[PDB]
């Protein structure tokens, strides 16, 4: 530690000259933080040759670069040694190109003077053309170094929750002259489905066959009653190719299952279709991971007001499952659904033993959603074909050039000059294991900033979008996410050794240094961000409060960033009003005619409690990050390693920008900034000036200020109306120096025993957790 090398380190590895079964491979650390590998070589025991090239995201503080030397023999694996190249050598931005002495422990040169050839260049944050200046033009070419390049002549319709009901918005003025206008998830799910001709492909983390995707009574639309195991299999029936790829569920950790983080159905949905002609395979990680990708693909009629006989392919991609549990609308009710939407849909896996018929609160399920038109819909469908030809079953894709007169090529369904038109690019947490056709040659991964893993080239470029996003980023940011901890290198070494956790992702570090850069530079940012109270399942577990342990750690790096740099700028002010935690909640009042249950919990329970104090938090299942109104991701992946290593869970996400609206010259006030104020409205139960520019200090004052009276409304003992809104500020303090602490009264949530600060396990190990 001495050089915060905050920025890209492009990297060769490209041999040892002689070393005086055999895998040897080169890692690289930053300091003691790994940040990279070289694949293994066999039958080169003498003369290893990897020349293999990376793009490393660095935001670290490092004294030495250091490459190690070893091989992975099955029989025993060996340290060969290890190569120094001081930081001081890079940190000016020239290219390094050395070959380098590689010693043993006691830094002596090994047997024979071993040398390793790398090259090296730092860039420094600054160095990159969108540093601090967002997208910047319609000309901007995409995240650089990723499998999927950016698609042009797009379009995204973005979902707030599975549903929508009528009228819900207010009015939300955009930039073309009309008004933001909701789109609803399962309404177009259904009819996607419904009207597909050639084929259906769905990957899902859990499939629940017995779901109806259509429920508004208010908003009936026909067949939309039919559960969608009834509608695929009518439609493979029919003769359309209905593929699907579930998690195989059969494989779940056992202890990670029985705490509540594993509530899925898929093996019962291979039952319900096999015999059918609906392909549904079961699909292993290759576990200890899941395959968490959300998709829908289909064929869609091509738009053309005459009509053309033609069709398109249309994608599905973000955090909604097809199972239960999903279905819900802004409203997220804990009581009044029971006997309507969520009768036959109650889902609360934070009680044991919660069912129907002992009564809420239901946990509501808030959620982000996306659907793809143009050529990134036909990306998502090449994802689907990679990992079917991997783990699918028979030889039963749709072969788009035999189809080439019915379904067109990849095309684009606005003009570039249109200013509705979305550049979208797609982006992935896979490997080769998982994943057919990725390139073999080291020149090739490296372009398309594929890594090597222990054993599989990685796809790593969802981790690549957000770093980028974060980056680029002026004016604010604002996160919703199912988890958010990482960057355990940098941790404090309270109580644990930071190397041991592995949580390596930048994601939180790369906000907090944006957050620093802005304060140095004495210009206005924000960070907001929205998690779930407790992430699902009993949240006594061992579990549950292991990552909440992580999560608390990962805010206290980050306010001890902010505070430090407020600090140097001789400021005293609150670091909550530039980096912000929320979740979200809802209490119902017991009106007349509520949903009656046969039966109660336990008398002296969390399910008794939180049934009588009528209140629970909504679940935040989102994973989605809106920079500067002006560009947005929406995936599967949350803010954890889990989804952001590569390596560990499957992961899928978009990022997207409409050309014509970006923040540059004018404020950005296209689809991602009414969708990003439609949400605001939903969670704060109201509109207001201020909220048109979330830099500002009125904007975080005032958000913070509405989120500390809804806590106040549901953690209250009293309650005498609903909450107004939803969002509630996160419920811990921040020490003067950065330390997370209890709120007075909540060292458990209420309604629980379970520790806000969550708990270090001394059983479960960090890559089940983090
Ligand atoms: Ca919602």
């Given at each position: 530690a001495q050089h915060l090398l905050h920025g890209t380190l492009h990297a060769t590895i490209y041999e040892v000259d002689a070393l005086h079964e055999t895998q040897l491979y080169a890692t690289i650390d930053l300091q003691k933080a790994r940040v990279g590998r070289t694949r293994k070589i066999k039958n080169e025991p003498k003369n290893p040759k990897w020349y293999e090239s990376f793009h490393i995201y660095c935001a670290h503080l490092a004294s030495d670069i250091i490459f190690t030397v070893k091989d992975d023999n099955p029989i025993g694996a060996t340290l060969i040694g290890r190569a120094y190249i001081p930081v001081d050598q890079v940190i000016n931005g020239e290219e390094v190109d050395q070959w380098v002495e590689i010693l043993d422990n006691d830094r002596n040169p090994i047997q024979g003077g071993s040398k390793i050839h790398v090259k090296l260049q730092y860039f420094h944050?600054?160095?990159?053309?969108?540093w601090n200046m967002?997208?910047?033009?319609?000309?901007?070419?995409?995240?650089?170094?990723?499998?999927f390049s950016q698609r042009q002549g797009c379009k995204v319709s973005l979902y707030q929750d599975a549903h929508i009901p009528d009228n819900?918005?207010?009015?939300?003025?955009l930039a073309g002259g009309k008004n933001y206008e909701p789109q609803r998830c399962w309404e177009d799910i259904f009819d996607a489905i419904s009207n597909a001709k050639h084929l259906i492909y769905i990957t899902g983390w859990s499939v629940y066959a017995?779901?109806?995707?259509?429920?508004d009574s208010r908003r009936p639309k026909p067949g939309?009653?039919?559960t969608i195991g009834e509608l695929l299999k009518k439609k493979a029936s029919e003769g359309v190719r209905v593929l699907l790829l579930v998690w195989?569920?059969?494989?779940?950790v056992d202890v990670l299952k029985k705490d509540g983080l594993m509530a899925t159905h898929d093996e019962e949905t291979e039952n319900f279709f096999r015999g059918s002609d609906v392909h549904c395979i079961l699909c292993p990680?290759?576990?200890?991971?899941?395959?968490h990708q959300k998709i829908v693909v289909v064929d869609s009629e091509m738009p053309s007001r005459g009509g053309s006989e033609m069709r398109r392919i249309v994608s599905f991609v973000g955090?909604?499952?097809?199972?239960?549990?999903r279905y819900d609308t802004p409203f997220h009710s804990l009581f009044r659904t029971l006997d309507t939407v969520?009768?036959?849909?109650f889902h609360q896996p934070?009680?044991?033993?919660?069912?129907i018929t002992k009564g809420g609160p239901r946990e509501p399920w808030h959620d982000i959603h996306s659907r793809l038109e143009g050529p990134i819909a036909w990306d998502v469908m090449y994802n689907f074909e990679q990992r079917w030809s991997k783990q699918?079953?028979?030889?039963?894709?749709?072969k788009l050039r035999d189809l080439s007169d019915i379904i067109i090529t990849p095309?684009?369904?606005?003009?570039?000059?249109?200013?509705?038109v979305w550049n979208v690019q797609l982006f992935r947490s896979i490997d080769g294991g998982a994943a057919?056709?990725?390139?073999?040659?080291p020149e090739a991964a490296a372009e398309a900033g594929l890594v090597s893993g222990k054993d599989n080239i990685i796809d790593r470029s969802i981790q690549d979008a957000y770093i980028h996003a974060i980056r680029r980023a002026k004016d604010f940011i604002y996160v919703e996410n199912q988890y958010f901890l990482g960057s355990?290198?940098?941790?404090?070494?309270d109580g644990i050794t930071?190397?041991?956790?592995?949580?390596?992702?930048?994601i939180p570090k790369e906000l907090s240094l944006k957050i620093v850069s802005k304060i140095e530079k004495g210009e206005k940012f924000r960070v907001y961000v929205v998690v779930p109270?407790?992430?699902?399942?009993?949240?006594?577990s061992g579990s549950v409060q292991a990552i909440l342990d992580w999560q608390r750690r990962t805010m206290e790096m980050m306010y001890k960033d902010v505070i430090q740099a407020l600090r140097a700028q001789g400021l005293e002010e609150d670091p909550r009003n530039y980096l912000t935690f929320f979740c979200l909640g809802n209490r119902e009042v017991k009106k007349d005619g509520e949903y009656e249950p046969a039966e109660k919990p336990d008398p002296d329970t969390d399910y008794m409690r939180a049934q009588e104090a009528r209140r629970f938090m909504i679940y935040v299942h989102t994973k989605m990050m809106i920079v500067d109104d002006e560009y947005i991701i929406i995936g599967?992946?949350?803010?954890?390693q889990r989804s952001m290593?590569?390596?560990?869970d499957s992961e899928i996400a978009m990022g997207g920008y409409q050309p014509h609206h970006l923040?540059?010259?004018?404020?950005?006030?296209?689809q991602i900034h009414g969708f990003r104020m439609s949400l605001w409205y939903e969670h704060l139960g109201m509109l207001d000036?201020?909220?048109?520019?979330?830099?500002?200090l009125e904007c975080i004052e005032k958000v913070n200020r509405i989120s500390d009276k809804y806590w106040d409304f549901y953690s209250?003992?009293?309650?005498?109306?609903?909450?107004?809104?939803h969002l509630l500020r996160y419920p811990i303090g921040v020490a003067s120096e950065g330390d997370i602490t209890e709120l007075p009264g909540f060292?458990?949530?209420?309604?629980?025993?379970?520790?806000?600060l969550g708990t270090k396990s001394?059983?479960?190990?960090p890559i089940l957790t983090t």
């Open positions: 944050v600054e160095e990159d053309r969108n967002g997208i910047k033009s319609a000309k901007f070419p995409g995240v650089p170094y990723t499998f819900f918005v207010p009015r939300i003025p017995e779901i109806a995707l259509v429920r939309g009653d039919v195989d569920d059969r494989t779940s990680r290759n576990t200890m991971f899941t395959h955090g909604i499952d097809l199972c239960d549990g969520h009768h036959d849909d934070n009680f044991t033993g919660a069912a699918g079953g028979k030889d039963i894709l749709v095309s684009p369904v606005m003009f570039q000059e249109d200013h509705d057919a056709g990725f390139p073999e040659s355990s290198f940098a941790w404090a070494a930071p190397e041991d956790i592995n949580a390596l992702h930048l109270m407790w992430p699902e399942g009993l949240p006594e599967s992946a949350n803010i954890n290593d590569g390596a560990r923040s540059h010259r004018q404020p950005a006030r296209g000036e201020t909220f048109l520019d979330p830099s500002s209250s003992e009293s309650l005498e109306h609903d909450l107004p809104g060292e458990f949530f209420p309604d629980t025993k379970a520790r806000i001394d059983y479960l190990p």
